[PDB]
């Protein structure tokens, strides 16, 4: 009958900063850090007790029903997801990222390869490159028609140095339908861009 919640679940802060996250549970709470593709690392047990071989930046307040987790002097290694745990119960967590590298995406567009068209499949790829923040909007226009439902996009993790993202949207359709229209557009919407940047190409 043990219940627990999370705090903002996603926040961003600059290098060498102080960040806090809160859970509200009624039992022995622990804190973990997990980097993408790897196993969790214990940081704090019983709310306040710091695990050994772990930077003194980290700490936890054990007052009332809420549990704080604080991080001082934010290092580049500290960028990962964090979450709390009470007995067998665990919360999804909270992603982390830094700030103020406000950059426009380098938007490119790719036609399908000739080798691909032989197998009767056409994949059009639009690429966004190195930007911040991660919030963008991509829509496919085919002969000036909004394309919805037939698109799959993918996002990279925040790059270690330039602190930027990258998004790749792939429009996928039959060879017959590709050879049916001429102009394929990949319009881009970003808060950074003064105007939406549109890239296109004529088939041929």
């Amino acid at each position: 009958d043990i219940q627990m919640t999370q705090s903002p679940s996603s926040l961003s802060a600059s290098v060498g900063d102080t960040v806090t996250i809160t859970c509200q549970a009624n039992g022995y709470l622990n804190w973990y850090q997990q980097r993408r593709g790897k196993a969790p690392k214990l940081l704090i047990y019983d709310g306040s007790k710091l695990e050994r071989g772990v930077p003194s930046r980290f700490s936890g307040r054990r007052w009332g029903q809420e549990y704080n987790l604080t991080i001082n002097n934010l290092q580049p290694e500290d960028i990962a997801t964090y979450f709390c745990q009470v007995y067998e119960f665990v919360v999804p967590g909270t992603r982390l990222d830094l700030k103020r590298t406000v950059a426009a995406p380098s938007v490119f567009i790719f036609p399908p390869s000739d080798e691909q068209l032989k197998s009767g499949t056409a994949s059009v790829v639009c690429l966004l490159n190195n930007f911040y923040p991660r919030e963008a909007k991509v829509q496919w226009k085919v002969d000036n028609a909004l394309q919805s439902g037939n698109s799959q996009e993918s996002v990279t993790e925040q790059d270690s140095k330039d602190s930027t993202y990258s998004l790749s949207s792939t429009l996928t359709l039959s060879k017959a339908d590709y050879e049916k229209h001429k102009v394929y557009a990949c319009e881009v919407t970003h808060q950074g861009l003064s105007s939406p940047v549109t890239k296109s190409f004529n088939r041929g």
């Binding site: 022995y28 622990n30 973990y32 790897k38 196993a39 969790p40 690392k41 214990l42 047990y45 019983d46 695990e51 979450f83 745990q85 009470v86 007995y87 067998e88 119960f89 665990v90 919360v91 999804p92 967590g93 380098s106 490119f108 790719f110 036609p111 399908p112 390869s113 080798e115 691909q116 197998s119 499949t121 994949s123 790829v125 690429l127 490159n129 190195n130 799959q152 993918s154 996002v155 990279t156 990258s166 790749s168 792939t170 996928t172």
Partner: protein
């Protein structure tokens, strides 16, 4: 030195069975409970159960009850143990990274974790990927790695000579059942015409190796 080592990746059809192993060593093992956890893609952790090494007693929640079987056996000197998890009647949404960890205290704190074991559940037989080039036009280019099962592939450039500004996107799961990703790279405009650009793609599960040359 403590140590928890988990077995290699697994791939199976639904309704089948799978066994993942966890071998513990450098500590007094009878004195600590071992828990199993799993993590579905993009999701949080999820408790699978615990097993008492002294008695072999298992404890599993409602959902994995019926399926799942936690087991253990020890070496002669009781210096090394092996902990198995047998998940039965696999369902597609059982695809997750399976972890094993040590419960140190009554705080249920987990200080030592296994590396994790990848377990993939679906139809879709083993298939190599098709690698199509992405022609350039500063400018950008790359490779398209379409239709392969299962994950993962490892993409480099010029046998690992070009690592600058490389963006290898995480694969996506196409509605067919096959995965597909994209690898790209950025170079100055004067690069085209003299330099040789090659993407190195490896898909171990299908033993498929491909080196493709990208060019306008």
């Amino acid at each position: 030195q403590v140590q928890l080592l988990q077995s290699g990746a697994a791939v199976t059809k639904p309704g089948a069975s799978v066994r993942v192993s966890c071998e513990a060593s450098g500590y007094n093992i009878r004195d600590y409970f071992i828990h199993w956890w799993r993590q579905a893609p993009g999701q949080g952790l999820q408790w699978v159960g615990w097993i008492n090494p002294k008695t072999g007693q298992p404890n599993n929640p409602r959902q994995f009850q019926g399926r799942v079987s936690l087991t253990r056996h020890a070496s002669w000197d009781f210096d090394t143990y092996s902990f198995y998890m047998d998940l039965k009647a696999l369902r597609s949404d059982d695809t997750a990274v399976y972890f094993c960890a040590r419960q140190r205290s009554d705080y249920w704190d987990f200080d030592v974790w296994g590396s994790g074991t990848q377990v993939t559940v679906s139809s879709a037989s083993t298939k190599g990927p098709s690698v199509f080039p992405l022609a350039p036009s500063t400018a950008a280019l790359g490779c398209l790695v379409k239709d392969y099962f299962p994950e993962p592939v490892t993409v480099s450039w010029n046998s690992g000579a070009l690592t600058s500004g490389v963006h290898t996107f995480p694969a996506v799961l196409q509605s067919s059942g096959l995965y597909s990703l994209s690898s790209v790279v950025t170079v100055p405009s004067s690069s085209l015409g003299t330099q040789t650009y090659i993407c190195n793609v490896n898909h171990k599960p299908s033993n498929t190796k491909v080196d493709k040359k990208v060019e306008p």
